[PDB]
Amino acid sequence: MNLMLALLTNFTLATLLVIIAFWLPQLNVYSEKTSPYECGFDPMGSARLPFSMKFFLVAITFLLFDLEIALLLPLPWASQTANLNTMLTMALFLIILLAVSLAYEWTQKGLE
């Protein structure tokens, strides 16, 4: 029953330590002028964040290579079986189904 005793112990030191740092001098009596001088060294910066694509694909591109290496995960439990040939013949398919899915897209990464 002692796991949650070992988790909420950990946060409660951390969720404590924000206030004793952030908050404690935050109410101190120093000046702290409201002037809009903050947001350093790009003073104003008025724009939307524009769509920039080769930022985007490197999200998608991963998400799919991700899945099957969940599918690929239960090899070391499956190395203990009865008929094993249906493993080696089958196990090696996923991989090559992964590696193929590279080679195609590999004609165009662009600047990744």
Binding site: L24, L27, N28, T34, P36
Partner: protein
């Protein structure tokens, strides 16, 4: 004797002294003597480093610092001995856990109304407040109108000043509001009746002094400080939330520097507009400044951009 032009690195013949001159007001006067030329001897109490943000104010060899306590009758006698005019802004809000606050408007302004009178200052000055009346109010607001009585005895020439509730940049008057993110705005006392006072903008008061600083011909003759038009509404407390869109402290924190459940809540609603017959401002002018236009600047909050007011 005045030389040249008033830019900086000039003379203009007046010395001064300004006691206090650390917190909101005094910092903002000396900055007008670090321009037209002076010799501004600013003493200060306890603060070694809180006085630095001041120093690029006079050119070079103009302002000069000393150290003093103020209950020692010598500390006020060592400086002033060479001076022309000496004004006095000293005094504060809440009773200190050390200074019992009773005579710090009585003994202190007299303690510096000691040898100053003797030693040959001239055009000595002191501060009053538009709302202080010797009838019964208000525990802090009282003892201030004693100085108008008790202290005026000494130095027959004063031109002691009587301004209103003032709104500066870093000031605590109009800033007690909008710090009120809280269980809710509760006016004083939950009534929209007698707000508001004459909210003059801090420039005009600090341009009054230096307009009387060599006036000439105002000594003994006290003045009071007009506000803008005209009286004001409850909306002033709504106006705060209309646009806002809803020294020597410590290392960590200060134990008590509160909202003071005491005179503070009742000092703001005491209103009492008072005698017009005081000259009191355009004569010392020429200044008067509004509110509606000058209250965006000092108020900037978490939108920081939109106004459309």
């Amino acid at each position: 004797i005045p030389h040249g032009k008033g830019g900086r690195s000039s003379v203009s013949g007046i010395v001064a002294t300004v006691f206090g001159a650390t917190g909101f007001l005094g910092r903002y006067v000396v900055n007008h003597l670090g321009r037209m030329g002076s010799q501004v001897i600013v003493p200060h109490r306890c603060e070694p480093y809180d006085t630095m943000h001041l120093r690029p104010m006079g050119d070079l060899g103009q302002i000069i610092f000393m150290d003093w306590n103020g209950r020692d009758k010598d500390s006020i006698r060592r400086a002033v001995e060479h001076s022309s005019v000496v004004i006095n802004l000293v005094g504060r809000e809440w009773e200190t856990q050390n200074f019992d606050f009773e005579d710090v408007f009585v003994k202190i302004p007299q303690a510096i109304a000691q040898v100053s009178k003797e030693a040959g200052v001239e055009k000595f000055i002191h501060i009053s407040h538009l709302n202080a009346d010797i009838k019964s109010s208000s525990k802090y607001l009282r003892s201030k109108a004693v100085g108008e009585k008790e202290v005026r005895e000494t130095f027959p020439e004063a031109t002691i000043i009587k301004p209103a509730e003032i709104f500066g940049r870093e000031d605590r008057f109009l800033n007690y509001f909008a710090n009120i993110r809280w269980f809710g705005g509760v006016p004083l006392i939950s009534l929209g009746k007698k707000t508001v006072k004459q909210p003059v903008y801090i420039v005009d008061v600090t341009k009054g002094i230096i307009n009387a600083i060599k006036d000439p011909d105002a000594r003994g003759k006290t003045f009071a400080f007009v506000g803008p038009s005209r009286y004001l509404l409850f909306d002033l407390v709504q106006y705060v939330f209309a646009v806002a869109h809803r020294i020597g402290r410590l290392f960590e924190i200060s134990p008590f520097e509160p909202w003071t459940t005491r005179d503070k809540v009742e000092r703001i609603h005491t209103t009492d507009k008072i005698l017009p017959h005081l000259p009191g401002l355009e004569d010392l002018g020429v200044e008067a400044t509004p509110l509606e236009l000058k209250a965006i600047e000092v108020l900037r909050r978490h939108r920081t951009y939109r106004w459309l007011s």
